[PDB]
Amino acid sequence: SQIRQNYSTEVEAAVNRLVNLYLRASYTYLSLGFYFDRDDVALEGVCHFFRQLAQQKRQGAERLLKMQNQRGGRALFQDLQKPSQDEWGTTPDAMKAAIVLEKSLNQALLDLHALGSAQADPHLCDFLESHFLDEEVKLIKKMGDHLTNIQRLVGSQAGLGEYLFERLTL
Amino acid sequence: SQIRQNYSTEVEAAVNRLVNLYLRASYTYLSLGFYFDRDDVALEGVCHFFRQLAQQKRQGAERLLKMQNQRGGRALFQDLQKPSQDEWGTTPDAMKAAIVLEKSLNQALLDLHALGSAQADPHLCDFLESHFLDEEVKLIKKMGDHLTNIQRLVGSQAGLGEYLFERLTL
Amino acid sequence: SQIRQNYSTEVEAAVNRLVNLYLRASYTYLSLGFYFDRDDVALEGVCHFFRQLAQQKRQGAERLLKMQNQRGGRALFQDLQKPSQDEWGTTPDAMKAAIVLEKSLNQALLDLHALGSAQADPHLCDFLESHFLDEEVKLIKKMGDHLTNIQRLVGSQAGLGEYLFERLTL
Amino acid sequence: SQIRQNYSTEVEAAVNRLVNLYLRASYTYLSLGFYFDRDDVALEGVCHFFRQLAQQKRQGAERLLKMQNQRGGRALFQDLQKPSQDEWGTTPDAMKAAIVLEKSLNQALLDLHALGSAQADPHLCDFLESHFLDEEVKLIKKMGDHLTNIQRLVGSQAGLGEYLFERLTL
């Protein structure tokens, strides 16, 4: 490449992997969203919450891909594994699955940051800090807040609590 | 002092003490606010309620300090004791602690008013009546209204009631 | 905690300590401000300068506290030691004390950054760089500029210089 | 009187006396103002400062007179003694004379308040607190601030300091 400079093959490959994880996350959120749109589930605020996340995760993948090209790396795509479930249970079940997913994305971001540090690639390290690390911490905090509220509600009386959380928080 | 007139050393000292009480109240409200911002507590309206009170109490301290200087007294600061708890329980627990705190501030205001009356210091007496005494009565009434509503709710079904009060009142 | 990830107990404790330092700084600036509001000191621009800093330092403490909760740490508050003086001398005396205070805050920021680096916590490191480190460097530069100007003035003729600096710079 | 109620002859007389003191104060400020308008004094900001005070003191007398009639008392006017000086010296001399005058007005307000308290006349007591006592404390603080600044300046180099204070404060 005529532009590549200080960009390791290790980081290049890791970035491609991270693109796959983001796209798979988007796919998972797509499935979550449409499950809550089912006539026999019918929680519109929950559907909207996960559809917005599907967009955000796709957007993150696209930002990674733009950066790959800015650095002179080469995007390589792999298959996208289907989401881990076909049906997602209740709101708390779904929100727990979402936090699990985000923690995994965050760990991948942290791993990539560590790799960039090891490879003395400050551009990468700054890119992740500026566009990804704080967004993850903010989102996971929001999810934990939501889980706490849902749990306080669905302890009391489950269907009622699920409805109220969807109406009054989401 | 070239300006001091009809301002007793007794009042001057009492005002400094009252500044400390207001600042400590602000500090307590800061702690209350951030506790309700915890991911495992997550009651945003409660957090906002106490953060607003932290501001109000700091503002009261500043007004007292401005008055001290207007009268030719000298501000003296003491250490600020940490708040009485590190964790604040449920919404009713917190609101009860807040009413306890405000009653103590109100009694200090009443004590200072009595001192000003005894010292024949009408400026002080007017200052407290105009900026502090009615604000306290209004705030304590609001807190009592809140406590009554919370209690009516958390009798019924506790988690549900706590959520509803936060969503629909705060 | 359901959200905590890559957040060391060491950093958590250090953040709580740093909150205390910021709050104590705010308190010091409050005292500085009101001293310059005394009828026998009466330098309104100096009063305004330190009152603005009191706000800024309180704001920094609040940002730290928000971050503590975003990461799943637990805010713990300690007593706030009273400021180191009850009277603050002349403008240069005050500005020197302020630079001393800010250097100490900056060193605490630098220490915490080093700890985050050691603990491989890039979110923390980015947070400090983005919200605190440059703000400190900018403020300390401003203070050094001020000290240089004050010193050039109060060499010449002290009272006159103090008045002019307050009128024409602050 | 068909309206008079709870209004003592003692207060009525004291109010008339206080009107005289306010009018005499206004007269003094008129003289101060025009002295600083002399071509051989020529401090326009000082002239403006005292002319504004002359207006304020006349306004206070008029408010007292309105209140006298609201209560069913009878305004009685006495001669207005000429001001205590024909020439007022330097800015600090003038400002000291002004503080002396205001302290005397404030003491008269305090005396009248005490009389109203003794006579169980809350309307009077409220009237003075609301329209006069805080205005005096604010004005005397402003004068003390001014005196402190003037003194810091005219120590250094007198004519220069007098000019600068007039240009940059007034």
Curated annotation (Swiss-Prot), chains A, B, C, D:
Residues 52-59 are annotated as: Catalytic site for iron oxidation. It is found in: Cytoplasmic vesicle, Autophagosome; Cytoplasm; Autolysosome. CDD domains: Ferritin. GO terms for cellular component: autolysosome; autophagosome; cytoplasm; cytoplasmic vesicle; ferritin complex. GO terms for molecular function: ferric iron binding; ferrous iron binding; iron ion binding. Keywords: Acetylation, Cytoplasm, Cytoplasmic vesicle, Iron, Iron storage, Lysosome, Metal-binding. Its main location: cytoplasm. Residues 5-154 form the Ferritin-like diiron domain. Fe cation binds at Q52, Q55, Q56, Q59, E62. GO terms for biological process: intracellular iron ion homeostasis; iron ion transport. Stores iron in a soluble, non-toxic, readily available form. Important for iron homeostasis. Iron is taken up in the ferrous form and deposited as ferric hydroxides after oxidation. Also plays a role in delivery of iron to cells. Mediates iron uptake in capsule cells of the developing kidney. Delivery to lysosomes by the cargo receptor NCOA4 for autophagic degradation and release or iron. In horse spleen the light chain is the major chain. Belongs to the ferritin family. Oligomer of 24 subunits. There are two types of subunits: L (light) chain and H (heavy) chain. The major chain can be light or heavy, depending on the species and tissue type. The functional molecule forms a roughly spherical shell with a diameter of 12 nm and contains a central cavity into which the insoluble mineral iron core is deposited. Interacts with NCOA4. This is Ferritin light chain. It comes from Equus caballus. The gene is FTL.
